[PDB]
Design a protein around this nucleic acid. Sequence first.
RNA 1: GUUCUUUGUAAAGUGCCUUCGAAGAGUCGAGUUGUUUGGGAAUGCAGCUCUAAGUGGGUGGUAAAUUCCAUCUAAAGCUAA
RNA 2: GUUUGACCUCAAAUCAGGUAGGAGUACCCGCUGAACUUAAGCAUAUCAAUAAGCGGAGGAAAAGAAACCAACCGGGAUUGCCUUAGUAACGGCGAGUGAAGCGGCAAAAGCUCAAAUUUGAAAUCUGGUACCUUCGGUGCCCGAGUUGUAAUUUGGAGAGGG
Lengths: 60, 64, 99, 138, 185, 187
Amino acid sequence: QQREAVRQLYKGKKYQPKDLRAKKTRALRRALTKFEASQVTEKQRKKQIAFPQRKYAIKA
Amino acid sequence: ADDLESELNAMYSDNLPDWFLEDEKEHSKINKPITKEAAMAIKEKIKAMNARPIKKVAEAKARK
Amino acid sequence: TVKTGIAIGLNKGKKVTSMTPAPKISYKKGAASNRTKFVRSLVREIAGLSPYERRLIDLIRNSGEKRARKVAKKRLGSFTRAKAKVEEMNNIIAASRRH
Amino acid sequence: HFRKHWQERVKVHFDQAGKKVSRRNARATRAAKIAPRPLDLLRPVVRAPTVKYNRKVRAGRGFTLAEVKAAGLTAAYARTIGIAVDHRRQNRNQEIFDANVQRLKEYQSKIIVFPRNGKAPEAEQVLSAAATFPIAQP
Amino acid sequence: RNLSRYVKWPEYVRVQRQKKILSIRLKVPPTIAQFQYTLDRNTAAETFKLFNKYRPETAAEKKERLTKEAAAVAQDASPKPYAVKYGLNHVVALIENKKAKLVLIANDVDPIELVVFLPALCKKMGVPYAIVKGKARLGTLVNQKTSAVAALTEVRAEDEAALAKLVSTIDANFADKYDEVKKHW
Amino acid sequence: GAYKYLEELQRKKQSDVLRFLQRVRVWEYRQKNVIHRAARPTRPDKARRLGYKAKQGFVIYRVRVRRGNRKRPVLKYQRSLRATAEERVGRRAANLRVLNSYWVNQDSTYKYFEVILVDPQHKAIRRDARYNWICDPVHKHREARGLTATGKKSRGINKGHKFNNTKAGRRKTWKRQNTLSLWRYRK
RNA sequence: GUUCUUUGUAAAGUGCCUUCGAAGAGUCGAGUUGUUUGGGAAUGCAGCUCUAAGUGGGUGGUAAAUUCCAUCUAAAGCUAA
RNA sequence: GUUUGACCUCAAAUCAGGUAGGAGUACCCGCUGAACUUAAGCAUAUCAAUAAGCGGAGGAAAAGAAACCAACCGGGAUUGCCUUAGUAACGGCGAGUGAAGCGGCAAAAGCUCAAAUUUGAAAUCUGGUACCUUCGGUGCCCGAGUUGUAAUUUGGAGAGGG
């Protein structure tokens, strides 16, 4: 009950108590997030839009 | 800045200033690269050191 | 030239119809630009001369271009580099005295 | 004069059959992952170097920029369509140039590129562009 | 009694004081020594009074101007701006293109190698230049803490004459005055 | 910009200007601590040539290293002074990743280097697609594993015939010369 | 396979004429000491001394000098199987 | 103005938020580095750039898109297998030591900066705070930054103008 009350008190806050944060692994918590890992440069994004990998086949 | 210059000079005593000249001459030495003769001297000195007896044996023989 | 179609001699080798590949600009790697020349001339004017360059100038004046080139080769390690340095100092002397 | 007086190391390939199975599994997995594309890119025909081997042709790394331009496409698009491009190879042999250009023309006429937004027509997967476009000794 | 002569100052104070002594006591090459000759009090005040009319846009002012453009979006919306140019690479480019009408160079730049070539470049390009005391004072002109350089390329019609008089004044007080000494050690 | 001028002038290292600057600066460096944080790059052109950016998360440390002759043991040489400088700075700031380093100065006792470091925890680095490669755990202590430019040069990592006489080259040749490769159907 | 705003004179590719075309320094390289590989000239690496150029520079280790030729483009960086 | 400030440099805080250390270590990357042994018993040499010692990583590591190999009608990042070949070469009457390019195959993948005036608009970014559809978004604000953060270009090119 008390932990859930603290969780609802902190809901949506940027900084949570460390015991309320997810444990996972030290290395997993040090890894880049999906957003940071997915960041690309403007030049690379333009190239990806202009020349994506195509779907083709060998028949005719 | 006679006042400041003499203050720093007397602090050091506690053309160019003395502190600067001494600092510069501590590190303005000449690194002449080693010569073949000196290197051979080094090698033979190491050989002489490594071909010494131990003190137990030396002192025992000397006492005898 | 044109291969003679036989396995020995001058210009030996098989004969196939030639093509001239487009000249790659990486082969234009040491070329000079007008702005690069401008920058190097200005920096030369600002910075002046290294001491060994000064004594190369003195040697060129007094003891001869042969001895200047020999001293330059001693301080550079390469005969072509000594030639380049001596020609550069000669141009500097001509521009700094005559024109 | 002098003998080898020490003890060697031993590498034993007990995993030869297991590794064959693993390579076969990996190829099938990659085929499923990239279907209906082939497992290999189109490679050019190239003369082997040196006087011992220059009598025959083999597969090269990738088509020259000049050959791609002659075939009528750009390097970026060809790379996305399944063609190997090699920027460091140069052409000085019109026979090899013509063979590679014809190779690219035939590959373009033999592949079907699907629209990047439209509905995909049914098309089976062919695994080997190499088998469908074999290198031929001139 | 006053012990400042015998106060054991911190190491950082001692080092900066010794650096000040060393700079004046050493024999300085002329290309560096030219930065010890700057604009005098009166002409520097006049120069800064001119440039403070062309102090560039602040962030709040940019929001207001982009507000007006957005109204007129859905050339004409905003007028042609007049402001001083201040980036080092930008001003070197302006000098090399001779677009700059007057260049102000801070005397206190560390490393000094960043501006030690600018007077020679401005001479080879014909651009009027002046060495002034204070990268901080230059930065005040462009909303920064410090600025290595500042420049005027375009001025308003009501200020062309003031700019020309300022250039002539700097020529008389700064070029003819320091020409002999800036070439000596 | 000013790049061409800076590069040419800093190449002209025996001129009066650069000798004067070198003298004053080397005295000041001897005044400061053996390893200390530099406020800004002494050679901005060289730093950004080696990958420095003027943004939060980029750090410059200046480090003083004793020369081959001038050691204090409280002749054989295989250890690089620049490598020693980089490793000592990395140990001093182990929260950071060492990117590159460059020579700034020297006297008869010491050489002086400036080490470029990146903060892998800073969001300005983690959201930069051009630099967050250094946030990956595989790049911890590059200078300790010999993966900097000086490390690769000392290891002899280069293409061609001239680069088989290294430690790695000799290890590979030893296992070539005396590894039995026994196949199931013996060859 | 369905649905949502279509993005948009924003972004990118291909054609011709012309002007350019920035490309990393106490580094490259040289000498010497140690070490490593070599039968050897010689080679790699580190210390020390000296230290470039821009139609340049590296490499093509039989002795050195010279002239050509061929081939790449260092002294910054990432990258699956 | 004997004042009041702008900066620079250097500090401090149980300041706000983070991060490093230790373990394991078969495999991987650096440093450091023997001797026994074998060669007439050997100082060259070999063992061996091995054992021991120190440091640093990952699920692989390292290497990697040529300042390459070649000398051909030329090939074309790196890695690994087969190979080259037990060959050329050396030394020995037949004891021994010993390459590399090419070739076949497994796998295949390419790219990023620095160097440019956005100068009709630092277009870039950390943080605090408030809300939201919370691996993040938006507004406001304190800042970083012109001693250069974005866009544009990377030699295979590419940029400016038409």
